[PDB]
Design a protein around this ligand. Sequence first.
Ligand code: PA9
Ligand code: PA9
Ligand code: PA9
Lengths: 332, 332, 332
Amino acid sequence: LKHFLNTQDWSRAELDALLTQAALFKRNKLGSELKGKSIALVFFNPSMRTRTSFELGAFQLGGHAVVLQPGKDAWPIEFNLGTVMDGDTEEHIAEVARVLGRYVDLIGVRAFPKFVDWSKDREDQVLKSFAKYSPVPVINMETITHPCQELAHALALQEHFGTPDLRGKKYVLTWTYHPKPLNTAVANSALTIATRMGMDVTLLCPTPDYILDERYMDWAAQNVAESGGSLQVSHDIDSAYAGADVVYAKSWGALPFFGNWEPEKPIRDQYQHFIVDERKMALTNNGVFSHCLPLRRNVKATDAVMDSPNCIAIDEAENRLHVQKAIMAALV
Amino acid sequence: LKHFLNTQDWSRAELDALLTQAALFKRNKLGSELKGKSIALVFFNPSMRTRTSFELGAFQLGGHAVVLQPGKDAWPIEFNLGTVMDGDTEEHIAEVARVLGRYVDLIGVRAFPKFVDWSKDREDQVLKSFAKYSPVPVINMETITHPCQELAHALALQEHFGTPDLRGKKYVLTWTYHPKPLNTAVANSALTIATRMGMDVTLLCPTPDYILDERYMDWAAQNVAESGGSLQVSHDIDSAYAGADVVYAKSWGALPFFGNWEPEKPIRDQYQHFIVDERKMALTNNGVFSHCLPLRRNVKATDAVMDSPNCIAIDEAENRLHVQKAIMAALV
Amino acid sequence: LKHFLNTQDWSRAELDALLTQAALFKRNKLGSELKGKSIALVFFNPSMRTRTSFELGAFQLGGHAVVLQPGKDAWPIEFNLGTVMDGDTEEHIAEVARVLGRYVDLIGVRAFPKFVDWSKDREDQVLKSFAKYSPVPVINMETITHPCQELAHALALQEHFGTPDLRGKKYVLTWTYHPKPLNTAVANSALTIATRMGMDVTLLCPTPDYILDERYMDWAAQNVAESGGSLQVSHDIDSAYAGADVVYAKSWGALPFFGNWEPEKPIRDQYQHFIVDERKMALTNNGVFSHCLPLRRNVKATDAVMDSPNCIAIDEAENRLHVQKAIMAALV
Ligand SMILES: CC(=O)N[C@@H](CCCNC(=O)CP(=O)(O)O)C(=O)O
Ligand SMILES: CC(=O)N[C@@H](CCCNC(=O)CP(=O)(O)O)C(=O)O
Ligand SMILES: CC(=O)N[C@@H](CCCNC(=O)CP(=O)(O)O)C(=O)O
């Protein structure tokens, strides 16, 4: 059974076919690819774009999305095997995925890490469990990676440069400030897709403590080798932005401080100057800027940057709708 | 771009066309005016009728409504300009409205005042922000006015009297008791639509402290002058109800006590006799009674009044569905 | 007006027609029985299967379900008559049911007992109120009985034995452990449907304190007399399971301890050995096992039992979709 858990699992030809189908759906939004079909959107965390885009996408293709929120409207789910369920969990994922599999044709899942132990969060237990027990295709709506965002981001870049080939472009994935420590998912996905696209990638962050999990650094290295791009970690803002064609900002908490955020709070607080402003964007090569949203203005990016004609964040957000429809159509 | 923020913004011919389209939809509920289209219903406060009527209306016209609840399922939104977003707000309305504008064809918004500072609440910031940044038509699902309710109310009155012309009718908008201070929205809208319809309007309330914001008193005066009706503020129950053709009850907190409700609590508590009972309705001219709902029985109106054949509250509530479909069809 | 509040209210011929229509819908899932129609699913308690199955069922039949959650998204409702609504309740069921009746064609309701006074919970006030004031058919989505579950359960049994006639089969409805006291609804429904099907039923529970309310014991006795089966209460595990063809587990709090759960906590804690494991299932006559879900593994049933080919819980859960579509089609 084929799922969409990570782009890294898909071949380039498959990914390209997805992006092309996405571009096609953007031209002809109404279709019958999901006529009489349905998808269960299981959210363990908040969402505005994801929930809206998937719901509308199912509708535009003649299908129906059922939005569920365990612990809110649906019952809380257990994921550990062989444990004695006497805690807050009412039922086990083995039952949930099998039942849903009798109702819907597709299952989307969103589950952020708990932020207490990266060792456990990095295992992607929720997503894997759904993929393991579900008799129907599973779609990652963001767990520790965000493959749907990668494709929306990629398509938006191809549309901006007027070509499917982004090789050679200088891509800067930069960390930015935020009062609280966030999921690395989007950062991990950006690194993954930018290198898979064969761009010259620079991971710009404050200190080595903010470097992404080895898993994704390794995925990127393997991708660079296969696509002809390049990977590089930098802590110097000015040299990073220099001549950049793309600047993708995202904030995340240092992995080494998982479950121990108190001491890392004073650490990030002294780097809020990583905020993407006009000055830093001025060093780029008339580069485009984007963020996955939700973004806090004057914290992650200044108002000027967000309103500049070079910010393609809205286009990228719109593309979430088109690429997800391509993914559902492919899996169905 | 044309929005439906307040009936006061629309011409009489436009309003009449809306009410007639509403009456038409009531006869033929299924249509294709919204085929393949969608509306984002953004609720910042609870709702039963509004959410249900809009959702079904979109469905009956071949479209789809996506229900969102910032702070609940969607991310909390910021509205102030140029501020440093380091508080509870994750993203700015500028982004939210622009993103939604890439997904849906219409945006409905419901946001009650915060009840801390009327000076700020009366600015209708949420609604205006959506209308400002949204590339698609915005619909007021109740903020400080409730235009959708005005039309449902108006249509129900025209159907009751068997005519579109309500000029000459004596209309009594009366305050009623409630343990807590409420939004003036419905009261403001009633005053607005009743005068726009050219009726002889009497705003019956306990003391001058309960008179509506000048903005709406002025809208009503201008409406009276243009339609040939009349406006009047009264604090005497018996003289108000006398010979009335319509009695519309609603409770609201005194504007002068915004952000300082403690001292106004003992003030309303001594006027719970404003409750619409058989006695007061007996003074009317076989007048009809209505309320926007949700209504607390034996507090705002007695059981007898609510069950009398003269209560048209259910009909008015049903009409929310029909007029809103007319509004969406017109804006699309 | 015909509602679906309990199977006990329906004749055998009607019930059989429902199960047959259900089997038919399972073969041809898409239809037009609810084209342009809608159902309001009012949930006062959590749900995953019920909400999903009804929502999809409405969609597959060309209709639309509107999901509501009083106190969450919709306004809190009052049910007592003639009371002064100055509490947490904003509106009365008389208004709610009448309004909904102007919007939707069907009303589903889910409302578990409050667990403070069985004398009040057993009156089924919410369900009855909706059925009383609603101008359109009402469907029990589980209150103190769960008729939709009975039919899903019944159909699954008929499919398992390859016949509509389950007379003669030995049916064991057994109590099982759970850290907290639960609703007896499913247990009451199982007893009701198993006897209505004319099986030899044994209610296996720890002590006489766990025997179901007389109402359902009496329904079962009347059913046994009419169908030719048999009813029996047992407290001995081994003799109960012996030669059983069906084993339906469910946990519930002792009725005599309603509103006084502290002393019954230590009572159930000494019977967690009622958990359906391989040993007990080994005594059966190659009997099938099922549970309504959500089920806690290793608490209500061991992992081995849940994964055995004799567990038909997933099939039964799937059938919720098919029988509910038959019910809606019949009531519409
Ligand atoms: C700060 C926070 O917790 N945010 C998420 C945003 C994920 C990307 N954003 C989306 O997928 C858009 P939506 O569907 O509206 O959430 C994160 O940092 O991982
Ligand atoms: C007491 C309270 O906060 N209520 C609101 C009711 C608004 C009119 N009522 C509606 O639009 C009906 P629904 O969509 O179900 O809320 C108010 O007083 O402004
Ligand atoms: C422990 C608990 O409170 N549970 C309920 C389950 C009812 C049957 N189960 C269902 O109808 C499935 P769903 O629609 O997902 O709830 C009870 O014991 O009465």
